[PDB]
Design a protein around this nucleic acid. Structure first.
Ligand SMILES: [K+]
Ligand SMILES: [K+]
Ligand SMILES: [Mg+2]
Ligand SMILES: [Mg+2]
Ligand SMILES: [Mg+2]
Ligand SMILES: [Mg+2]
Ligand SMILES: [Mg+2]
Ligand SMILES: [Mg+2]
Ligand SMILES: [Mg+2]
Ligand SMILES: [Mg+2]
Ligand SMILES: [Mg+2]
Ligand SMILES: [Mg+2]
Ligand SMILES: [Mg+2]
Ligand SMILES: [Mg+2]
Ligand SMILES: [Mg+2]
Ligand SMILES: [Mg+2]
Ligand SMILES: [Mg+2]
Ligand SMILES: [Mg+2]
Ligand SMILES: [Mg+2]
Ligand SMILES: [Mg+2]
Ligand SMILES: [Mg+2]
Ligand SMILES: [Mg+2]
Ligand SMILES: [Mg+2]
Ligand SMILES: [Zn+2]
Lengths: 225, 153, 115, 307, 110
RNA sequence: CGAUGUUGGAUCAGGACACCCAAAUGGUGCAACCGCUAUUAAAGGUUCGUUUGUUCAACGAUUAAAGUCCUACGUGAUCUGAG
């Protein structure tokens, strides 16, 4: 067997599309790399389970723990955020942590996983057993030769209505058992909002390959310096 | 408030906008020089630039084939794109097409016309706006500065 | 964000908050000057035909960063003296309520789980 | 004589267009680099600080926004204001401008010569600087006058100070009365006919006229506004970037007029500041790369512990 | 609403002849160096382009007769040759379009 | 009367002071607290609901206070038509 190498770049390092002087992105990028020297932010995707240790002043112990599945990742630059989902005592709790908040002591990934979707916001309307995670679960270490294995797990759903109309093509959700909860009639009606030309409009795509190469050199130079 | 909107409202909506540019792009590939309204030609320039970029990827790349399948509504132009247009453009990166303002159409609507074409087409050249020759009085005076500047520096 | 005429959920063991009724416990009035209340803001409830004050512990509208968000509007029953009528709270409560100890000492004394 | 319209690129040949661009570009660098010695080219005398004195502001460019955290755990938003090219242009005597305070003129970022007026180009030629984009007038007391042509940097403001910001806000065009003034609209479904966002009654029956102060639909947004009491958190030296708390009026990549705050609380807060401005040559020492306020959590600082 | 009184011709003349409503003159008219006709500075010459368009239609009309089918398109480059000319070595391997008229001056061979 | 369109709401409010609140003050059967009464001041403010077409009124919750009145009992070439 062989072990091919691939690069992982955090999503917040990808500058947003728009009209901002690139000098602003360099200023944020320098501060982000300085913060990463002290706080070790590991590689984690949507669906991976993370434990985050924050510092709250009003607790008996100044540290505070929270373990849950990462529903989504969003934001760019110094204000990157991620949302953790966990259910305790039958109560669903969601917290939107900040990656670069100086009140975070450490970030640990107890299970590195990638799922069929890119934003797991459909767990609010899913069954409770898909959101409950053991608080004191032991960390799991994987070899680099696994390439972040994808967890193909279809999810049951509560009866309608839901938080959002997941049947619509605009969400592109394939990790949900639609056959069990929906009939053929509702599937055809949800297709009336389908827009087939969006995937073929070649001016709407963001080509950031050139930008990523430039910022990789800056990251590599920071480690060497 | 249309701040930051780079696209234009054409036809009967966002879907009709693509189809209008789909027919124009098909005509541009087959004939290599077409004339239409200036607003519609300006939008067509962006797609004609990137369509060649998909052509350079190759005949085997599936994404390029599916992308060329949708835009080339006539099915005898896909072999032409991957075997004539793409091989011709290998040197330049973005200098694929030219846009010039044709005078107003001699009709009631009096629309603003434009001509869009591909480089190196097998057609008579357009009357491009030619710059002044270097022998002109103003150019000769400025060339005196350059000769003196290059003599010392 | 809890405002007038919102169905709420009671998270302490009380005779009034546990006995089933044919009308859900709705909100009557929020004592904030703005017509909408946030976490740790007093509220008046209409439970089983009578009016009881309550304290909101968790809502569903997102708030500031690093603040927990729950899946149900959770309130705790309260009296005019500020002493809760319940005995213990099993549903987790945000840790930010410990900031106010002068008036929430009794409410936080019975809480079990903090997030 | 119906002379035809012309532009700089009309009569230039293809072999001289690159040459002219090089010609003007080399002039700008020579002119800008020849002004980098304010204290070596016979500057005006410098007076010590006095109560009630006002300093000279700058003209900066708004880059964007960043989040910033303090040592107490709170989160603040700072706007990156970059000073690109700032030079004092002309000095007006006290009795010729207002009669109370002198006026100092400050220019904006460098622009092309080929698209400015004849008088504007001629004015800068005598001074020896490339044309500027925006020009603003600053009210400065006689004890803080600066010789025209003296460059200014972002170090003119030291972290900890409160500054004002004046710039044209975002223009939203011809907007209706609901968006412009915030009037409530009519209901949407209870029988209303062709009335959902209209102002409604605009006056009373008796007066038989419309008062001059009446609110009506019209232009919204493209006007000059000022923000007061913005605290300066961090100053960057090499890139000349100023961090200001809160949101400053104006869109991205616009020119912003920055001055010391005129609020009554923030009076005489310039004794511990450079006067009349920061001269890098006189100090003969290298400033830190970044200047931080005492309450700012630095990116290379240990994580917050509330122990 | 309905007008209250008839507008006098004195008022109408002021409105109908205001400088905004008058036709503005054009100062960007120039003579074409090649044909001597009139054109604007930023617009291609109407006479010269019409000269090209007529020739382009003739070339395209000849191509149509060389591909009878509606879905027949060449897979190679195209070169147009006039009377008194023969294909070059670099022009081999390409479809040939023959025109009886002499090669036009503006068209340039490579 | 060869037409001055008529209650209530919705929108927008202009004004008066015989002031409901906010500020200053005299008197008291004013110790303090809570009140009663009088002088001065109109820049700003004067809530959300159940029943009734309702203005009005009753009732629930609250507020520093939920003022009185004029303006074709403002405002249908801006809307509503329950009466
Ligand atoms: K009458
Ligand atoms: K009033
Ligand atoms: Mg919802
Ligand atoms: Mg636009
Ligand atoms: Mg149209
Ligand atoms: Mg364009
Ligand atoms: Mg009852
Ligand atoms: Mg605009
Ligand atoms: Mg509305
Ligand atoms: Mg009608
Ligand atoms: Mg309507
Ligand atoms: Mg009058
Ligand atoms: Mg206007
Ligand atoms: Mg009459
Ligand atoms: Mg009214
Ligand atoms: Mg009023
Ligand atoms: Mg009075
Ligand atoms: Mg009072
Ligand atoms: Mg009336
Ligand atoms: Mg009415
Ligand atoms: Mg009407
Ligand atoms: Mg009327
Ligand atoms: Mg009726
Ligand atoms: Zn011509």
């Amino acid at each position: 067997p062989q072990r091919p190498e691939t690069r992982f770049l955090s999503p917040e390092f990808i500058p947003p599309r728009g009209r901002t002087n690139p000098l602003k992105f360099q200023i944020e990028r320098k501060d982000m790399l300085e913060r990463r020297k002290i706080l070790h932010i590991p590689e984690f995707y949507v669906g991976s389970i993370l434990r985050v240790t924050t510092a709250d002043p009003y607790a008996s112990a100044k540290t505070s723990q929270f373990l849950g599945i990462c529903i989504q990742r969003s934001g760019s630059g110094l204000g990157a955020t991620f949302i953790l989902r966990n259910t305790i005592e039958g109560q669903g709790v969601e917290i939107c942590f900040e990656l670069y908040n100086p009140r975070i002591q450490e970030i640990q990934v107890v299970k590195l996983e990638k799922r069929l979707d890119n934003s797991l916001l459909y767990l609010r309307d899913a069954l409770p057993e898909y959101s409950t995670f053991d608080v004191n679960m032991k960390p799991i270490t994987q070899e680099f030769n696994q390439e972040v294995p994808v967890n193909q797990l279809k999810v049951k759903m509560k009866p309608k209505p839901w938080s959002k109309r997941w049947e619509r093509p605009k969400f592109n959700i394939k990790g949900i058992r639609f056959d069990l909860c929906l009939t053929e009639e509702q599937m055809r009606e949800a297709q009336k909002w389908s827009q087939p030309w969006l995937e073929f409009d070649m001016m709407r795509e963001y080509d950031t390959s050139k930008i990523e190469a430039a910022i990789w050199d800056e990251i590599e130079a920071s480690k060497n310096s | 408030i249309s701040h930051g909107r780079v696209f234009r409202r054409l036809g009967l909506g966002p879907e009709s906008r693509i189809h209008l540019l789909q027919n124009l792009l098909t005509g541009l590939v087959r004939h290599e020089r077409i004339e239409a309204s200036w607003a519609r030609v300006d939008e067509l320039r962006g797609y004609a630039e990137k369509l060649i970029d998909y052509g350079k990827l190759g005949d085997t790349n599936e994404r390029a084939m599916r992308m060329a399948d949708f835009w080339l509504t006539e099915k005898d132009l896909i072999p032409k794109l991957f075997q004539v247009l793409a091989p011709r453009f290998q040197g330049q990166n973005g200098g694929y097409t030219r846009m010039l303002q044709i005078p107003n159409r001699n009709e009631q609507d009096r629309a603003k016309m434009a001509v869009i074409e591909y480089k190196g087409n097998c057609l008579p050249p357009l009357p491009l706006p030619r710059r002044d020759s270097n022998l002109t009085l103003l150019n000769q005076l400025l060339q005196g500065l350059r000769q003196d500047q290059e003599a010392s520096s | 964000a809890i405002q007038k005429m919102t169905r709420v959920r009671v998270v302490d063991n009380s005779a009034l908050g546990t006995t089933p009724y044919h009308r859900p416990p709705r909100c009557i009035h929020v004592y904030n000057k703005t017509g909408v209340g946030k976490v740790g803001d007093r509220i008046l409830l209409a439970i089983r035909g009578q009016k009881k004050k309550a304290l909101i512990v968790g809502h569903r509208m997102p708030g500031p960063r690093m603040t927990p968000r729950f899946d149900s509007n959770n309130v705790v029953l309260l009296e005019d003296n500020g002493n809760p009528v319940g005995t213990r709270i099993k549903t987790p409560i945000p840790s930010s309520l410990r900031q106010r100890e002068g008036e929430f000492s009794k409410v936080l004394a019975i809480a079990q789980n903090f997030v | 004589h119906g002379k035809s319209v012309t532009w700089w690129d009309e009569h230039l040949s293809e072999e001289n267009v690159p040459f002219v661009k090089q010609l003007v570009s080399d002039e700008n660098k020579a002119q800008l680099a020849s002004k980098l010695c304010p204290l070596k080219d016979e500057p005006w005398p410098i007076h010590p600080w006095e109560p009630g004195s006002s300093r000279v502001g700058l003209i900066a460019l708004k880059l964007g926004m960043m989040p910033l955290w303090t040592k107490d755990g709170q989160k603040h938003v700072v706007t990156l204001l970059q000073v690109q090219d700032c030079h004092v242009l002309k000095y007006t005597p006290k009795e010729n401008h207002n009669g109370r305070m002198a006026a100092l003129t400050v220019g904006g970022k460098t622009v092309s010569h080929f698209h400015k007026s004849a008088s504007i180009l001629e004015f800068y030629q005598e001074l020896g600087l490339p044309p500027k984009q925006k020009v603003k007038i600053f009210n400065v007391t006689e004890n803080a006058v600066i010789k025209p042509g003296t460059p200014l940097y972002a170090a003119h403001f030291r972290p900890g100070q409160y500054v004002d910001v004046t710039a044209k806000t975002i223009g939203k065009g011809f907007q209706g009365v609901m968006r412009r003034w915030g009037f409530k609209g009519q209901p949407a479904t209870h029988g209303q006919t062709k009335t959902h966002r209209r102002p409604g009654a605009i006056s009373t029956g008796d007066v038989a006229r419309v008062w001059p102060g009446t609110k009506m639909p019209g232009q919204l947004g493209n006007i000059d506004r000022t923000a007061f009491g913005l605290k300066v958190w961090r100053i960057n030296t090499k890139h000349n970037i100023i961090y200001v708390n809160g949101s400053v009026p104006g869109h991205k990549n616009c020119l912003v007029k920055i001055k010391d705050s005129k609020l009554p609380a923030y009076k005489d807060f310039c004794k511990n500041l450079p006067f009349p401005t920061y001269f890098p040559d006189g100090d003969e020492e290298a400033l830190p790369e970044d200047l931080y306020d005492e309450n700012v959590c630095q990116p290379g600082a240990p994580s917050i512990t509330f122990t | 609403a309905a007008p209250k009184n008839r507008r006098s011709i004195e008022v109408n003349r002021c409105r109908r002849r205001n400088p905004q409503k008058l036709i503005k003159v054009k100062n960007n008219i120039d003579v074409c160096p090649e044909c001597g006709h009139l054109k604007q500075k930023h617009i291609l010459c109407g006479y010269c382009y019409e000269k090209v368009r007529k020739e382009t239609a003739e070339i395209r009309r000849q191509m149509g007769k060389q591909e009878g089918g509606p879905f027949r398109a060449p897979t190679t480059e195209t070169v147009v040759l006039y009377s008194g000319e023969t294909p070059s070595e670099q022009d081999q391997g390409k479809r040939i379009i023959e025109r009886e008229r002499k090669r036009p001056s503006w068209f340039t061979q490579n």
